[PDB]
């Protein structure tokens, strides 16, 4: 019920500012004890908080980022917004939000709750959207009873990509791997699902690839090979 | 950038006890009470202890923590595989104006856990890429333990390294863990060779699959 939702750019460029947004419902920033902070987390790193402000709009940060942090709140919109500035790609990282709650006559729950987090990409080169191509199941390729097919998704940027099949009604048996990050700079992922072979002659399978970075949704068929 | 000192890794035998150890000051830790965060692969951190030694729900009572002078402690008794996580304290420092500290973070490690040997599927390129004057093969190598392969591709029998590219292995649900290989080619390439195959080495073993154009 509690939620916390962070939203704001995939990429920026070195320089410039970044402005994160954290929406959140379930619960009241204007409620005694209540906090939200962000922390934000260098990808293989470890977390660094950033900032919080809590319910009397009192505000606290990082003593060694301080020069370059504004946080703010909107209780019309319940959202919690974070600028820094003077992006560089050290700065590349997820950033999450995280509340903090004081139940009385207990002990505060220090960021008892983290939203899942937004990626952000700080670099030079420019979005690209990804390609998507059917992995079709081979005659030799099944496994038995059951057979595996996917999606290629090539050469895109900045992650991430997200992957789903048959709009979400297909959830058992699916595996989409983490992205390669090529030399050239691109990532690229794929998706496999696995099915019964025997299916493969009467369902229809297609992939649902989003990639947000680049406002692109493609719903890729993949049709047994022939 | 401060930074409270954990361990970089702990590990221990299901069922032992295992403490992950942090280290800060009198201004932090020294003056203030430390929460420790559970983060499995791929999610954010959660909760796991706060204030007095205290648990929120859904956190099991063999996760304890301690805290003496500058330094604080977490203690997992009853070691189990779902344990595997990176785990890290905070704390508040009143310094400054008043930040927060994390710690660095520290990998958990059960040992002793049974080898899985990988399975590997392997997809030749798409009709639809070479229509596009491209050629990507994609070997996909999962459920493997511990989480280390090496994989080699070969045109025809042998050995090509030009064009290929690998992930780290990532840990999986089930802690055991999944990595992928591409070799990218030209459509001349791939038409010109009678096969081409995916290796996987795990633990002096190897599985290998095979496509053909012609297929």
């Known amino acids: 019920q509690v939620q916390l939702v962070e939203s704001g750019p995939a990429l920026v460029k070195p320089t410039q500012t970044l402005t994160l947004t954290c929406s959140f419902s379930?619960?009241?920033?204007?409620?005694?004890?209540?906090?939200v902070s962000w922390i934000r987390q260098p990808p293989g790193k470890a977390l660094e908080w950033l900032a919080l402000?809590?319910?009397?709009?009192?505000?606290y940060y990082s003593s060694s980022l301080k020069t370059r942090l504004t946080i703010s709140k909107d209780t019309s919109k319940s959202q919690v917004v974070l600028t820094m500035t003077n992006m560089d790609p050290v700065d590349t990282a997820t950033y999450y939000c995280?509340?903090?709650?004081?139940?009385?006559?207990?002990?505060?729950?220090?960021?008892?709750?983290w939203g899942r987090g937004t990626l952000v990409t700080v670099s030079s080169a420019s979005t690209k959207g990804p390609s998507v191509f059917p992995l079709a199941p081979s005659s030799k390729s099944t496994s038995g009873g059951t057979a595996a097919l996917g999606c290629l998704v090539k050469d895109y940027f900045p992650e991430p990509v997200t992957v789903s099949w048959n709009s979400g009604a297909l959830t058992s048996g699916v595996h989409t791997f983490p992205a390669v990050l090529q030399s050239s700079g691109l990532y690229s992922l794929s998706s496999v699902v696995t099915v019964p072979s025997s299916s493969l002659g009467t369902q229809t399978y297609i992939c649902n690839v989003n990639h947000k970075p680049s406002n692109t949704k493609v719903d890729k068929r993949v049709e047994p090979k022939s | 950038q401060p930074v409270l000192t954990q361990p970089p890794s702990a590990s221990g035998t299901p069922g032992q006890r295992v403490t992950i150890s942090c280290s800060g000051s009198?201004?932090?830790?020294?003056?203030?009470?430390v929460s420790w965060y559970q983060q499995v692969p791929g999610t954010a951190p959660k909760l796991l202890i706060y204030?007095?030694?205290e648990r929120p729900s859904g956190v099991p009572d063999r996760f304890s923590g301690s805290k003496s002078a500058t330094s604080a402690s977490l203690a997992i008794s009853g070691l189990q595989s779902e344990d595997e996580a990176d785990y890290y304290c905070?704390?508040?420092?009143?310094?400054?104006?008043?930040?927060?500290?994390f710690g660095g973070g520290t990998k958990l490690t059960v040992l002793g856990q049974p080898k899985a040997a990988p399975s590997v599927t392997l997809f030749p390129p798409s009709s639809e890429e070479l229509q596009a004057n491209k050629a990507t093969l994609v070997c996909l190598i999962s459920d493997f333990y511990p989480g280390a392969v090496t994989v080699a591709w070969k045109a025809d029998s042998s050995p090509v390294k030009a064009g290929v590219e690998t992930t780290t292995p990532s840990k999986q649900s089930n802690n055991k863990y999944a990595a992928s290989s591409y070799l990218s080619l030209t459509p001349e390439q791939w038409k010109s060779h009678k096969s081409y195959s995916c290796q996987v080495t795990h633990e002096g073993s190897t599985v290998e699959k095979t496509v053909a154009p012609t297929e």
């Open positions: 995280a509340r903090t709650l004081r139940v009385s006559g207990d002990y505060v729950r220090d960021f008892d709750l």
């Open positions: 379930g619960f009241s920033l204007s409620t005694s004890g209540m906090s």
């Open positions: 402000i809590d319910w009397d709009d009192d505000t």
């Open positions: 009198s201004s932090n830790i020294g003056s203030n009470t």
């Open positions: 204030g007095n030694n």
């Open positions: 905070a704390a508040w420092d009143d310094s400054l104006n008043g930040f927060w500290v």
